[PDB]
Symmetry: C4
């Protein structure tokens, strides 16, 4: 087995085609299924896996009550083959209320964060053993991507933040070889707040589109040089911005450099990627709520400040249905690297108060150079049929 | 691993022997089991798998209600080893309300269709990744085989239809290499309506026996030339016709070339295969309903128009029990290629209205050159014992 | 991978040590577990598997009602790793109300019998495909070992019977190469009735200890010559006889040649094996009921007619607990072939009428050259705690 | 594959980082999960497994009642990948109410003890087959480690005791090659009572830290010479003693040689390991009950009698939560051998009498050379939510 280099061109895509759906919540009404949130997808060279953070309980279980909370000691990272729902034979890979995972061509790295808010621990598990750990550097919820990390030539990189969720924080980029931290670079450039990065290989480097939780409804960009560990950062140029909340399309702005100060506080994990001067991106359909999900290409979305000409829109989840986090993953093809994404479909509290739990299912799409139609692939559970 | 060529003679069979049964519905009354329909079987070079289209729910689950409907966004293709019932650890391979799968000797291809009736998307997934997609060409339920596709020397073929279910439609034959569509041929020949083809390798080509939903109770044939991509089509010669509905045996006809215009509208997926001038075929025992299942050889059934002399009949499911779809799969032996088939055993609505769901189990038989006796292997669930 | 020859001496044993227990019935009271009977064990070169005939239902399921019956179309052969209870992810290997399985060093052979009592079909499945089948030869419940067959140098042998259960029947010994029947030898010698053989390799041949259901409470022996397909048969010499029912030890007899005509009608599947002039054997503790289970060595039990000197007795299941069928399996060690056995622990009807089902768990012991103590390892379920 | 030698230096650790948690009890309230106790962890060269002794029943099951008892014939050793909770697909590896398991680099050895208190049997199962057995030598609960054994160059060693739990007993150290007992050494040295050893490779030998159930709240040490089979024993020097019960830190003593006669009777399985003159150890936080769990380094804890200066304390489970047994396992890294440990988190009787069962979950930590924070990772089940 050889290390991945991702040294192929990006697949030229026309949009996205359906790839996977797990129907977790519908199944939870007639089966023992894990309560989860913060899902993601990552693939080894042969096949894909779905990950999520468990809440230490199944849904039809009194312990599902009040699982809206983000951090308890019982949260563990779950890992199954993509499309295998989180049933009771699911492996809990590590203890984690925040995580990232990636395969370097030889083995899986898992970055697992747990413990006290003011003094958390990140464990680095590689090829089935604990190789390293780091403690909190700002004593304020050490946290990471909630999606796949990226490895080139046996060096994996992951973005982590510690500090305020509503003000300047301390973001660092780790470089990890076979589970061992070999270098840590501080964030540099013009991005002013970084959360929950969605990163992808862009050989010879790695590029991340993240969440600004402080002053931006435009999404920050972090560029990671894998050769010298140098970091740059900025914001997605597109005037059609990717965060939630955000302004209406007619009054939203980005200048590529600064947070836009437009409903900037709070946010949601999301993704985008560049193709030359253009941008492919997803976002919730609602400007204020985690409802619906759409993708489109923005002409000049990568290179032209405040560009708003979109094309090739697809509805993934219609706006009468709940969405959630979304993130990118990359899949090596015969001659190119494809970009895929997942959407977290959050059900229960706080939006749906008939039930006392909070959980999610997922839907997953992959880039295509072919053609496609239309649809909507929401969670699909009837809240009135659920155990409360 | 090398590509399959299927370049062995067809096994000379005397009939069929019992191979597998999953007891899905019986188990669903005391366990968490997927609601399914449109099952099939396909084998890699070592072992066989059962497939079906899930309805995004287990049976003992309020979401099972009104699963008689064919197309919802929560339908996914399920895949287990043959004989492993669809329990909660079952992998959902893709999103699909119509599908076909096949192994080319190196990896699995899945053809998965989902989305809006008037604008569906077919995804092509090979070796664990999305390689291609195509959109609806006639804006009227793009759809495919619901049984295995067939690959020779790395090229897989699958038959797809888009358009009216009760009139002239637009049928196309796709040729796919490692998940990439390399050629598309329109239907040609004398078949006037094609649905749900049951295809098999007949080196150097592929032969399909399908469903005419418009004017024929005789089954159409599609012949696929894998060298030059040319297509031919006709109808099975046998005067003992394979569709349901159909006329009784004394008043049924086929001329090998045209739909017979005998209770032609509607149909059921089924199969047959040639052996020289003769034909092995299955059909429902009832001429009007999806009840019972029988196989037999028709002497001159392939070559002689309106041939009605049968021999080697076997009852698979007696006529007091529900059947459903059936399809062929092929299994490479040491010196010959064997033909096998599955029968979908549909329980629930519309035939059984005590319950609100519709689901199925399967029974599976394989060609034998040996001897055998008699029996009947129906679904076996007591409708009165089931969750409603 | 090479064919097994079993060409090592038999391990010299001092008795038997505990090996496995599945606790099936206890688990069935809080879990979805298959209803079964007629279990057995067989091992490939690396590890062991438990087999049993399912009843097409779980225990906590209304379909478990009246599963005392031996033959229904829904019975399938289940196969798990030894000690994995028959949960809903269990693979149903074939359709069978009577079976035998064995691994030839390269792949699994399964012999699966199903269909009508007067016209059954035996399917021969090898390396995941149906290779052969045979129909009933006496039109009266074609049936086989309910324990492992035995293969030497790629030829597997299995004993089958068709005809009366209470009078002269037609017993045949099949020789099978990669699933294909290559020879069938009729029973020969002095054994007058043969059921449910427990066979083991005794290089260069195979030896079986079976059940006489007609005139003998002494167990018949069948010796199979794998070189020329010739058959011999006789009865176990031991005056301590192995069948149930049987006479008291003080009035039981065997002359090694004929059925003893001592409570000869009916019986139970069991086993024994030779070591020089001596015999290792198991039997129920009760003379009339399938209750308890004991093993011991009979001095001169193989060579001396009517020998009754036993030594090295062990209680496996005390006589306040239900037993059932038992059978031998053989396991290749570094320098010798070991003999192991399983005991079926039948619960429910007809003996326990609080519940309407009949099922079983298993316990498994292996020969040892070491030392051991005492115990009792019954099913362990409280009938009053069970779903009815 | 080659035999393990463990011939690398011990990793130099700063403390421990979170590795795994199974949430067994929380899940048992909404799923079918085994009742267990006496868990441990052991890894083959690629991955780690969790083990425990089942009670022949799931928790939500009337058979869970009165599972506080230590020895019934239905107890079996369960084995899953680490983090896969004990669901119904879990393999029962052998029959055992006391056990030890270890991988020698080529295959797994399991030591499984069951049967009558006064005449137990230990079975030795290697590479999937029973290779040896030994009977009770003192007729008083033959018993072993309840954690991993240790193998060097194909010879595995395990510590076993037979005799009084409250007085002089008969402890022996076994040496096992491919499942065959090749030598047995009696305990020698100054340890006066040995139970439940937690052993680890310390090339060229094996070192064990155990439980004195008679006169010591200081933990005994057993040193095993793998070259000549000689045995030495003593007590851990640390004045901060590891057993429960024990005196408070201001009045506890150890002289490295004798049991301290300080609340010596009874105990709990635990662990410690040397690093030069210092000692890493865990213990319950409570000095009288199995409540809480803490680790720390004792400066001079290995070499200096009655040393009480600690550093690098970590809370693993706070003292408001139940703990239980704990044990060490070792994991080979690239350049060093790491030490890890598990903590059994006992729920139910006798401490929690709302329910009638006794079961456990686990939490697992591994040595780290990096940094870490703080937390508490208790079982987490609400006793009021549980089936009784
Ligand atoms: C069948 O499916 C195909 C493929 O999905 C679909 O074609 C697509 O239609 C959409 C909508 O017209 C196209 O995307 C648009 O492109 C134009 C630029 O040409 C943009 O102006 C659009 O943006 C706006 O309008 C949106 C609502 O449609 C607003 O949400 C947005 O804020 C802008 O105002 C949009 O991006 C897309 O390019 C095609 N795709 C292709 C490959 O042609 C077709 O319409 C479907 N037909 C039916 C009957 O369902
Ligand atoms: C034990 O099992 C064997 C194998 O299954 C069985 O032998 C089979 O019997 C059937 C029925 O007789 C044979 O099939 C028939 O063949 C004749 C030609 O010889 C056909 O005319 C028959 O067709 C019609 O009759 C059917 C009703 O049986 C109608 O459904 C149909 O519309 C026609 O009118 C039919 O195909 C078959 O060939 C044999 N198979 C072999 C290998 O011999 C045997 O009968 C069973 N034993 C007992 C006692 O029943
Ligand atoms: C601890 O365990 C050991 C090993 O299991 C056990 O030793 C065994 O005891 C039995 C019973 O005494 C021995 O088997 C007997 O052997 C004599 C010949 O020496 C036979 O006569 C016995 O047969 C009869 O008695 C039986 C009842 O015991 C009747 O059922 C039977 O019909 C005959 O009348 C019987 O076969 C066995 O040989 C030893 N095994 C060894 C290896 O020594 C020991 O007794 C146990 N001790 C305790 C206190 O539990
Ligand atoms: C964030 O997490 C870090 C790492 O866990 C943590 O640092 C650790 O703090 C503990 C507690 O101070 C240190 O352990 C102590 O070391 C001193 C020697 O310097 C010992 O005297 C202590 O022993 C006693 O005190 C204990 C109570 O704390 C008693 O239980 C005990 O009986 C003794 O009386 C104890 O071992 C540990 O060394 C550091 N670890 C490192 C690597 O620095 C830090 O405190 C956390 N941050 C915050 C704000 O709490
Ligand atoms: C801790 C601040 C962080 C980014 C604002 O909040 C996240 C937001 C979440 C959210 O907005 O839904 C849920 C995440 N599980 C949470 N992360 C953690 C580690 O608790
Ligand atoms: C759309 C026409 C097509 C063939 C007549 O209908 C099928 C018939 C079915 C049927 O006759 O039972 C069920 C199939 N699930 C359905 N296929 C789709 C894709 O919905
Ligand atoms: C059919 C006669 C045969 C031997 C007497 O009866 C067996 C006895 C049984 C028994 O005595 O318990 C159960 C077996 N499942 C049955 N075998 C079959 C094939 O039905
Ligand atoms: C028999 C003495 C022994 C060590 C003191 O008791 C153990 C203590 C236990 C305990 O203190 O919790 C539980 C163990 N399951 C038990 N071991 C056996 C084999 O029954
Ligand atoms: C969930 O917990 C809350 C707070 O204790 C309680 O009011 C509510 O009844 C619980 N819900 C259920 C369904 O038990
Ligand atoms: C299924 O849905 C129908 C329509 O809403 C309803 O009348 C019926 O009661 C439902 N069935 C069950 C079992 O709840
Ligand atoms: C089992 O079936 C019998 C016969 O119909 C019936 O009398 C009995 O009530 C059934 N048992 C249960 C538990 O439903
Ligand atoms: C457990 O057993 C005891 C003793 O028989 C009994 O009193 C108690 O009710 C049982 N518990 C349950 C939950 O049935
Ligand atoms: Ca924001
Ligand atoms: Ca028709
Ligand atoms: Ca008899
Ligand atoms: Ca003590």
């Amino acid at each position: 087995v050889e290390y991945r280099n991702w040294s192929k061109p990006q697949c030229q895509i026309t949009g996205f085609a359906p790839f996977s759906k797990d129907n977790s919540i519908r199944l939870s009404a007639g089966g023992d299924i894990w309560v989860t949130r913060e899902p993601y997808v990552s693939c080894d060279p042969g096949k894909c896996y779905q990950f999520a953070l468990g809440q230490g309980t199944t849904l039809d279980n009194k312990h599902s009550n009040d699982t809206v909370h983000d951090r308890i000691p019982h949260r563990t990272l779950l890992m199954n083959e993509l499309g295998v729902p989180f049933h009771l034979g699911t492996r809990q890979v590590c203890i984690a209320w925040s995580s990232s995972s990636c395969h370097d061509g030889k083995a899986w790295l898992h970055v697992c964060i747990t413990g006290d808010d003011k003094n958390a621990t990140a464990s680095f598990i590689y090829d089935g053993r604990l190789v390293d750990s780091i403690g909190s550097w700002s004593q304020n919820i050490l946290r990471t991507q909630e999606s796949e990390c990226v490895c080139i030539n046996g060096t994996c990189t992951v973005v982590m933040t510690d500090g305020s969720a509503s003000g300047r924080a301390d973001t660092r980029i780790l470089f990890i070889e076979e589970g061992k931290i070999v270098h840590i670079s501080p964030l540099s450039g013009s991005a002013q707040h970084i959360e929950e990065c969605s990163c992808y290989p862009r050989y010879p480097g790695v590029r991340c589109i993240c969440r600004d939780n402080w002053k931006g409804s435009n999404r920050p960009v972090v560029d990671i040089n894998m050769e010298d560990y140098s970091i740059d950062s900025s914001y997605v140029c597109s005037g059609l911005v990717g965060d939630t909340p955000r302004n209406d399309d007619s009054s939203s702005n980005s200048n590529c450099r600064n947070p836009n100060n437009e409903r900037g506080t709070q946010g949601v994990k999301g993704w985008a990627f560049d193709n030359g001067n253009d941008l492919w991106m997803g976002r919730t359909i609602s400007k204020e709520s985690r409802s619906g999900y759409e993708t489109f290409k923005v002409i000049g979305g990568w290179s032209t400040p405040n560009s708003k000409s979109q094309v090739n829109r697809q509805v993934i989840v219609d706006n009468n249905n709940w969405s959630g986090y979304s993130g990118i993953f990359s899949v090596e093809g015969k001659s190119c690297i494809n970009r895929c994404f997942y959407v977290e479909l959050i059900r229960g509290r706080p939006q749906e108060t008939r039930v006392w739990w909070t959980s999610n299912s997922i839907v997953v799409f992959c880039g295509t150079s072919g053609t496609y139609g239309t649809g909507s692939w929401p969670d699909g559970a009837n809240i009135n049929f659920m155990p409360i």
